[PDB]
UniProtKB/Swiss-Prot annotation, chains A, B:
GO terms assigned for molecular function: DNA binding; DNA-binding transcription factor activity
Primary role: Transcriptional repressor of qacA. Binds to IR1, an unusually long 28 bp operator, which is located downstream from the qacA promoter and overlaps its transcription start site. QacR is induced from its IR1 site by binding to one of many structurally dissimilar cationic lipophilic compounds, which are also substrates of QacA.
Lineage, top ranks: Bacteria, Bacillati, Bacillota, Bacilli, Bacillales
Protein name, entry field: HTH-type transcriptional regulator QacR
DNA-binding region: 23-42
Gene3D superfamilies: Homeodomain-like, Tetracycline Repressor, domain 2
Transcription among keywords: yes
Gene from which this protein is expressed: qacR
Length: 186, 186
Protein backbone atom coordinates (compact mmCIF):
# COMPACT_ATOMS: atom_id res chain seq x y z
CA UNK A 1 0.00 0.00 0.00
CA UNK A 2 2.62 2.54 -0.91
CA UNK A 3 -0.11 4.51 -2.67
CA UNK A 4 -1.58 4.75 0.80
CA UNK A 5 1.85 5.43 2.30
CA UNK A 6 2.35 8.29 -0.18
CA UNK A 7 -1.00 9.87 0.70
CA UNK A 8 -0.05 9.67 4.38
CA UNK A 9 3.43 11.12 4.10
CA UNK A 10 2.09 13.78 1.75
CA UNK A 11 -0.70 14.75 4.13
CA UNK A 12 1.90 15.28 6.88
CA UNK A 13 4.44 17.11 4.72
CA UNK A 14 1.66 19.43 3.47
CA UNK A 15 0.55 19.96 7.07
CA UNK A 16 4.07 20.71 8.28
CA UNK A 17 5.28 22.86 5.40
CA UNK A 18 2.21 23.75 3.37
CA UNK A 19 1.29 23.13 -0.24
CA UNK A 20 3.86 25.19 -2.11
CA UNK A 21 7.01 24.21 -0.24
CA UNK A 22 6.27 20.50 -0.31
CA UNK A 23 8.02 18.87 -3.28
CA UNK A 24 7.14 15.51 -4.82
CA UNK A 25 10.80 14.71 -4.21
CA UNK A 26 10.38 14.80 -0.44
CA UNK A 27 7.21 12.79 -0.81
CA UNK A 28 9.00 10.25 -2.94
CA UNK A 29 11.90 9.60 -0.55
CA UNK A 30 9.97 9.93 2.72
CA UNK A 31 7.41 7.38 1.53
CA UNK A 32 10.14 5.16 0.10
CA UNK A 33 8.44 5.14 -3.27
CA UNK A 34 9.54 6.63 -6.62
CA UNK A 35 8.90 9.43 -9.10
CA UNK A 36 7.32 6.83 -11.34
CA UNK A 37 5.09 5.22 -8.78
CA UNK A 38 3.97 8.67 -7.70
CA UNK A 39 3.31 9.64 -11.35
CA UNK A 40 1.33 6.47 -12.02
CA UNK A 41 -0.94 7.10 -9.01
CA UNK A 42 -1.57 10.82 -9.10
CA UNK A 43 0.16 12.26 -12.15
CA UNK A 44 0.86 15.61 -10.46
CA UNK A 45 1.20 17.22 -7.06
CA UNK A 46 -2.16 18.99 -7.58
CA UNK A 47 -3.86 15.73 -8.15
CA UNK A 48 -2.09 14.12 -5.23
CA UNK A 49 -3.39 16.91 -3.04
CA UNK A 50 -6.97 16.75 -4.38
CA UNK A 51 -6.79 13.03 -3.71
CA UNK A 52 -5.94 13.65 -0.05
CA UNK A 53 -8.82 16.17 0.18
CA UNK A 54 -11.26 13.50 -0.98
CA UNK A 55 -9.92 11.04 1.57
CA UNK A 56 -10.37 13.80 4.14
CA UNK A 57 -13.88 14.52 2.91
CA UNK A 58 -14.59 10.80 3.38
CA UNK A 59 -13.32 10.77 6.93
CA UNK A 60 -15.41 13.86 7.63
CA UNK A 61 -18.52 12.03 6.35
CA UNK A 62 -17.72 8.92 8.35
CA UNK A 63 -17.22 11.16 11.37
CA UNK A 64 -20.53 12.99 10.76
CA UNK A 65 -22.40 9.71 10.38
CA UNK A 66 -21.33 8.70 13.88
CA UNK A 67 -21.74 12.17 15.36
CA UNK A 68 -25.21 12.93 13.96
CA UNK A 69 -26.82 10.22 16.03
CA UNK A 70 -26.53 12.70 18.92
CA UNK A 71 -29.18 14.75 17.10
CA UNK A 72 -32.71 13.25 17.10
CA UNK A 73 -34.56 15.76 14.91
CA UNK A 74 -33.22 17.30 11.75
CA UNK A 75 -33.52 20.79 13.20
CA UNK A 76 -30.94 19.58 15.70
CA UNK A 77 -28.73 17.98 13.06
CA UNK A 78 -28.69 21.36 11.30
CA UNK A 79 -27.60 23.21 14.47
CA UNK A 80 -25.01 20.56 15.30
CA UNK A 81 -23.40 20.11 11.92
CA UNK A 82 -22.85 23.87 11.61
CA UNK A 83 -21.27 24.08 15.04
CA UNK A 84 -18.93 21.22 14.08
CA UNK A 85 -17.86 22.91 10.86
CA UNK A 86 -16.89 25.91 12.95
CA UNK A 87 -15.17 24.26 15.88
CA UNK A 88 -13.35 21.63 13.87
CA UNK A 89 -11.74 24.03 11.40
CA UNK A 90 -10.45 25.96 14.36
CA UNK A 91 -7.83 23.25 14.65
CA UNK A 92 -7.82 21.50 11.29
CA UNK A 93 -4.11 21.07 10.30
CA UNK A 94 -4.63 20.89 6.55
CA UNK A 95 -6.64 24.09 6.70
CA UNK A 96 -3.70 26.29 5.82
CA UNK A 97 -2.42 24.11 2.98
CA UNK A 98 -5.97 24.00 1.58
CA UNK A 99 -6.19 27.82 1.53
CA UNK A 100 -2.80 27.92 -0.15
CA UNK A 101 -3.87 25.35 -2.77
CA UNK A 102 -7.36 26.78 -3.28
CA UNK A 103 -6.32 30.43 -3.69
CA UNK A 104 -3.82 29.28 -6.29
CA UNK A 105 -5.89 27.09 -8.59
CA UNK A 106 -9.39 28.60 -8.50
CA UNK A 107 -8.29 30.06 -11.84
CA UNK A 108 -7.82 26.64 -13.48
CA UNK A 109 -11.07 25.05 -14.66
CA UNK A 110 -9.18 21.78 -14.70
CA UNK A 111 -8.54 21.78 -10.95
CA UNK A 112 -11.58 23.98 -10.29
CA UNK A 113 -13.76 21.25 -11.78
CA UNK A 114 -12.83 18.49 -9.30
CA UNK A 115 -12.79 21.09 -6.56
CA UNK A 116 -16.54 21.37 -7.06
CA UNK A 117 -17.22 17.66 -7.09
CA UNK A 118 -15.58 17.70 -3.65
CA UNK A 119 -17.49 20.76 -2.53
CA UNK A 120 -20.67 19.04 -3.62
CA UNK A 121 -19.83 16.11 -1.39
CA UNK A 122 -19.79 18.45 1.61
CA UNK A 123 -23.11 19.97 0.51
CA UNK A 124 -24.88 16.60 0.48
CA UNK A 125 -24.89 16.67 4.27
CA UNK A 126 -27.33 19.56 4.08
CA UNK A 127 -29.26 18.04 1.25
CA UNK A 128 -29.87 14.99 3.44
CA UNK A 129 -30.80 17.02 6.51
CA UNK A 130 -33.21 19.07 4.42
CA UNK A 131 -34.72 16.11 2.56
CA UNK A 132 -35.31 14.37 5.86
CA UNK A 133 -36.70 17.48 7.50
CA UNK A 134 -39.41 17.47 4.86
CA UNK A 135 -40.41 13.83 5.41
CA UNK A 136 -40.87 14.72 9.09
CA UNK A 137 -42.74 17.99 8.90
CA UNK A 138 -39.92 19.86 10.56
CA UNK A 139 -40.08 22.22 7.61
CA UNK A 140 -41.29 22.23 4.02
CA UNK A 141 -38.70 23.01 1.40
CA UNK A 142 -39.45 22.47 -2.26
CA UNK A 143 -35.93 23.43 -3.42
CA UNK A 144 -33.61 21.32 -1.29
CA UNK A 145 -30.61 21.51 -3.62
CA UNK A 146 -30.93 25.28 -3.52
CA UNK A 147 -31.34 25.89 0.19
CA UNK A 148 -28.57 23.29 0.51
CA UNK A 149 -26.00 25.22 -1.53
CA UNK A 150 -27.07 28.34 0.31
CA UNK A 151 -26.71 26.92 3.82
CA UNK A 152 -23.39 25.31 2.92
CA UNK A 153 -21.89 28.54 1.59
CA UNK A 154 -23.45 30.80 4.22
CA UNK A 155 -22.07 28.59 6.96
CA UNK A 156 -18.63 28.35 5.35
CA UNK A 157 -18.65 32.15 5.23
CA UNK A 158 -19.29 32.48 8.94
CA UNK A 159 -16.52 29.96 9.62
CA UNK A 160 -14.03 31.61 7.26
CA UNK A 161 -14.50 35.33 7.75
CA UNK A 162 -14.68 35.58 11.52
CA UNK A 163 -11.57 33.88 13.01
CA UNK A 164 -10.51 36.89 15.22
CA UNK A 165 -13.53 37.13 17.53
CA UNK A 166 -13.21 34.82 20.59
CA UNK A 167 -14.31 31.20 20.07
CA UNK A 168 -17.46 31.44 22.18
CA UNK A 169 -18.62 34.52 20.32
CA UNK A 170 -18.30 32.63 17.03
CA UNK A 171 -20.13 29.53 18.31
CA UNK A 172 -22.78 31.98 19.51
CA UNK A 173 -23.16 33.79 16.19
CA UNK A 174 -23.20 30.49 14.33
CA UNK A 175 -25.97 29.12 16.54
CA UNK A 176 -27.80 32.41 16.12
CA UNK A 177 -27.48 32.03 12.36
CA UNK A 178 -28.68 28.41 12.60
CA UNK A 179 -31.74 29.77 14.32
CA UNK A 180 -32.60 32.68 11.99
CA UNK A 181 -32.11 30.48 8.93
CA UNK A 182 -34.08 27.51 10.14
CA UNK A 183 -36.81 29.95 11.18
CA UNK A 184 -37.26 31.49 7.75
CA UNK A 185 -38.20 28.10 6.29
CA UNK A 186 -41.58 27.87 8.05
CA UNK B 1 1.11 58.89 -10.90
CA UNK B 2 3.52 58.12 -8.02
CA UNK B 3 1.85 56.44 -5.00
CA UNK B 4 -1.48 55.87 -6.76
CA UNK B 5 0.17 53.76 -9.46
CA UNK B 6 1.69 51.11 -7.22
CA UNK B 7 -1.60 50.70 -5.35
CA UNK B 8 -3.08 50.03 -8.75
CA UNK B 9 -0.61 47.42 -9.95
CA UNK B 10 -0.73 45.93 -6.46
CA UNK B 11 -4.51 45.42 -6.32
CA UNK B 12 -4.04 43.88 -9.78
CA UNK B 13 -1.59 41.19 -8.68
CA UNK B 14 -3.26 40.60 -5.32
CA UNK B 15 -6.34 39.46 -7.22
CA UNK B 16 -4.60 37.87 -10.22
CA UNK B 17 -2.44 35.82 -7.83
CA UNK B 18 -2.58 35.14 -4.11
CA UNK B 19 -1.41 37.44 -1.32
CA UNK B 20 1.89 35.58 -1.29
CA UNK B 21 1.97 34.63 -4.95
CA UNK B 22 2.46 38.37 -5.45
CA UNK B 23 5.38 40.18 -3.88
CA UNK B 24 7.02 43.61 -3.76
CA UNK B 25 9.49 42.31 -6.33
CA UNK B 26 6.74 41.87 -8.91
CA UNK B 27 4.92 45.07 -7.90
CA UNK B 28 8.06 47.15 -8.32
CA UNK B 29 9.08 45.86 -11.75
CA UNK B 30 5.58 46.05 -13.26
CA UNK B 31 5.08 49.42 -11.57
CA UNK B 32 8.51 50.63 -12.73
CA UNK B 33 10.11 51.85 -9.51
CA UNK B 34 12.46 50.90 -6.69
CA UNK B 35 12.11 49.28 -3.30
CA UNK B 36 12.70 52.38 -1.20
CA UNK B 37 9.66 54.03 -2.75
CA UNK B 38 7.42 51.59 -0.92
CA UNK B 39 8.50 52.83 2.50
CA UNK B 40 7.34 56.31 3.64
CA UNK B 41 3.63 55.81 2.92
CA UNK B 42 4.03 52.07 2.34
CA UNK B 43 5.85 50.59 5.34
CA UNK B 44 5.40 46.79 5.38
CA UNK B 45 3.90 44.73 2.50
CA UNK B 46 0.81 44.14 4.60
CA UNK B 47 0.72 47.93 4.82
CA UNK B 48 0.20 48.32 1.06
CA UNK B 49 -2.30 45.49 1.29
CA UNK B 50 -4.20 46.67 4.36
CA UNK B 51 -4.25 49.96 2.45
CA UNK B 52 -5.79 48.58 -0.74
CA UNK B 53 -8.45 46.86 1.32
CA UNK B 54 -9.39 50.21 2.84
CA UNK B 55 -9.62 51.83 -0.61
CA UNK B 56 -11.84 49.06 -1.99
CA UNK B 57 -14.05 48.94 1.07
CA UNK B 58 -14.64 52.68 0.69
CA UNK B 59 -15.16 52.50 -3.07
CA UNK B 60 -17.69 49.71 -2.59
CA UNK B 61 -19.58 51.27 0.33
CA UNK B 62 -19.82 54.40 -1.82
CA UNK B 63 -21.08 52.71 -4.98
CA UNK B 64 -23.64 51.13 -2.64
CA UNK B 65 -25.06 54.45 -1.54
CA UNK B 66 -24.90 55.80 -5.09
CA UNK B 67 -27.19 52.80 -5.75
CA UNK B 68 -29.32 52.07 -2.71
CA UNK B 69 -31.76 54.81 -3.71
CA UNK B 70 -33.28 52.28 -6.05
CA UNK B 71 -34.71 50.55 -2.98
CA UNK B 72 -37.67 52.09 -1.14
CA UNK B 73 -37.81 49.71 1.83
CA UNK B 74 -34.93 48.29 3.83
CA UNK B 75 -36.15 44.80 3.03
CA UNK B 76 -35.36 45.73 -0.57
CA UNK B 77 -32.07 47.38 0.50
CA UNK B 78 -30.97 44.12 2.14
CA UNK B 79 -31.79 42.16 -1.05
CA UNK B 80 -30.12 44.72 -3.29
CA UNK B 81 -26.89 44.97 -1.27
CA UNK B 82 -26.50 41.21 -1.42
CA UNK B 83 -27.30 41.04 -5.15
CA UNK B 84 -24.87 43.85 -5.93
CA UNK B 85 -22.22 42.17 -3.81
CA UNK B 86 -22.09 39.56 -6.54
CA UNK B 87 -21.53 41.99 -9.37
CA UNK B 88 -19.26 44.79 -8.10
CA UNK B 89 -15.59 45.03 -8.96
CA UNK B 90 -14.83 46.29 -5.49
CA UNK B 91 -13.54 44.69 -2.31
CA UNK B 92 -15.23 41.30 -2.80
CA UNK B 93 -12.78 40.28 -5.55
CA UNK B 94 -10.13 40.32 -2.79
CA UNK B 95 -11.79 37.95 -0.32
CA UNK B 96 -9.61 35.05 -1.47
CA UNK B 97 -6.59 37.33 -1.06
CA UNK B 98 -7.74 38.54 2.33
CA UNK B 99 -8.17 34.92 3.49
CA UNK B 100 -4.49 34.14 2.88
CA UNK B 101 -3.39 37.38 4.46
CA UNK B 102 -5.33 36.80 7.65
CA UNK B 103 -4.10 33.18 7.78
CA UNK B 104 -0.48 34.37 7.72
CA UNK B 105 -0.67 37.27 10.14
CA UNK B 106 -3.18 36.03 12.71
CA UNK B 107 -0.27 35.36 15.06
CA UNK B 108 0.35 39.12 15.44
CA UNK B 109 -1.69 41.90 17.09
CA UNK B 110 -1.28 44.84 14.68
CA UNK B 111 -3.52 42.67 12.45
CA UNK B 112 -6.49 41.71 14.62
CA UNK B 113 -6.87 45.50 14.96
CA UNK B 114 -6.91 46.87 11.40
CA UNK B 115 -8.23 43.55 10.09
CA UNK B 116 -10.93 44.06 12.74
CA UNK B 117 -11.29 47.85 12.47
CA UNK B 118 -12.22 47.21 8.85
CA UNK B 119 -14.86 44.73 10.04
CA UNK B 120 -16.97 47.67 11.14
CA UNK B 121 -16.87 49.25 7.69
CA UNK B 122 -17.82 45.80 6.33
CA UNK B 123 -20.82 45.19 8.56
CA UNK B 124 -21.93 48.81 8.87
CA UNK B 125 -24.01 48.56 5.73
CA UNK B 126 -26.04 45.80 7.38
CA UNK B 127 -26.21 47.63 10.68
CA UNK B 128 -27.86 50.66 9.10
CA UNK B 129 -30.23 48.50 7.05
CA UNK B 130 -31.22 46.52 10.14
CA UNK B 131 -31.42 49.43 12.56
CA UNK B 132 -33.41 51.60 10.15
CA UNK B 133 -35.64 48.60 9.55
CA UNK B 134 -36.43 48.66 13.25
CA UNK B 135 -37.40 52.33 13.25
CA UNK B 136 -39.33 51.69 10.04
CA UNK B 137 -41.00 48.74 11.74
CA UNK B 138 -40.28 46.34 8.86
CA UNK B 139 -39.03 43.90 11.51
CA UNK B 140 -37.74 43.81 15.06
CA UNK B 141 -34.12 42.79 15.74
CA UNK B 142 -32.83 43.39 19.27
CA UNK B 143 -29.32 42.06 18.57
CA UNK B 144 -28.46 44.09 15.48
CA UNK B 145 -24.67 43.72 15.60
CA UNK B 146 -24.97 39.95 15.84
CA UNK B 147 -27.43 39.85 12.97
CA UNK B 148 -25.35 42.37 11.06
CA UNK B 149 -22.21 40.28 11.51
CA UNK B 150 -23.97 36.99 10.75
CA UNK B 151 -25.36 38.50 7.51
CA UNK B 152 -22.15 40.17 6.44
CA UNK B 153 -20.42 36.84 6.76
CA UNK B 154 -23.11 34.55 5.42
CA UNK B 155 -23.28 36.70 2.31
CA UNK B 156 -19.56 37.05 1.85
CA UNK B 157 -19.68 33.26 1.96
CA UNK B 158 -22.21 32.85 -0.82
CA UNK B 159 -20.30 35.36 -2.92
CA UNK B 160 -16.89 33.81 -2.32
CA UNK B 161 -17.51 30.05 -2.56
CA UNK B 162 -19.70 29.97 -5.67
CA UNK B 163 -17.45 32.36 -7.67
CA UNK B 164 -16.93 30.18 -10.77
CA UNK B 165 -20.44 29.20 -11.89
CA UNK B 166 -23.33 30.79 -13.83
CA UNK B 167 -23.51 34.40 -12.60
CA UNK B 168 -27.29 34.31 -12.86
CA UNK B 169 -27.45 31.16 -10.77
CA UNK B 170 -25.44 33.02 -8.09
CA UNK B 171 -27.86 35.91 -8.18
CA UNK B 172 -30.66 33.40 -7.77
CA UNK B 173 -29.27 31.68 -4.64
CA UNK B 174 -28.32 35.04 -3.20
CA UNK B 175 -31.94 36.10 -3.45
CA UNK B 176 -33.33 32.89 -1.99
CA UNK B 177 -30.85 33.60 0.78
CA UNK B 178 -32.02 37.18 1.45
CA UNK B 179 -35.51 35.80 1.23
CA UNK B 180 -34.92 33.10 3.84
CA UNK B 181 -32.78 35.25 6.16
CA UNK B 182 -35.24 38.09 6.38
CA UNK B 183 -38.12 35.70 6.89
CA UNK B 184 -36.27 34.30 9.88
CA UNK B 185 -35.89 37.69 11.51
CA UNK B 186 -39.53 37.71 12.68
N1 LIG C 1 -9.57 13.26 10.01
C1 LIG C 1 -10.10 14.36 10.72
N2 LIG C 1 -9.95 14.43 11.98
C2 LIG C 1 -10.83 15.43 9.99
C3 LIG C 1 -10.97 15.33 8.66
C4 LIG C 1 -11.70 16.38 7.91
C5 LIG C 1 -12.23 17.46 8.53
O1 LIG C 1 -12.92 18.39 7.69
C6 LIG C 1 -13.55 19.61 8.20
C7 LIG C 1 -14.17 20.18 6.89
C8 LIG C 1 -15.01 21.50 6.93
C9 LIG C 1 -15.45 21.69 5.43
C10 LIG C 1 -16.33 22.94 5.12
C11 LIG C 1 -16.66 22.96 3.58
O2 LIG C 1 -17.48 24.13 3.25
C12 LIG C 1 -17.86 24.31 1.86
C13 LIG C 1 -17.50 23.46 0.85
C14 LIG C 1 -17.95 23.74 -0.56
C15 LIG C 1 -18.70 24.84 -0.85
C16 LIG C 1 -19.15 25.13 -2.25
N3 LIG C 1 -20.37 25.09 -2.57
N4 LIG C 1 -18.20 25.47 -3.26
C17 LIG C 1 -19.08 25.76 0.26
C18 LIG C 1 -18.69 25.51 1.53
C19 LIG C 1 -12.08 17.59 10.03
C20 LIG C 1 -11.41 16.61 10.72
Amino acid sequence: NLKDKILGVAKELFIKNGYNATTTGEIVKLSESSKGNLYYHFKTKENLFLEILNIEESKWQEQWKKEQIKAKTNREKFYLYNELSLTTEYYYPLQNAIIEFYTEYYKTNSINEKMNKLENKYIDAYHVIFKEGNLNGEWSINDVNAVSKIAANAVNGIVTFTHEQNINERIKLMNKFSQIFLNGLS
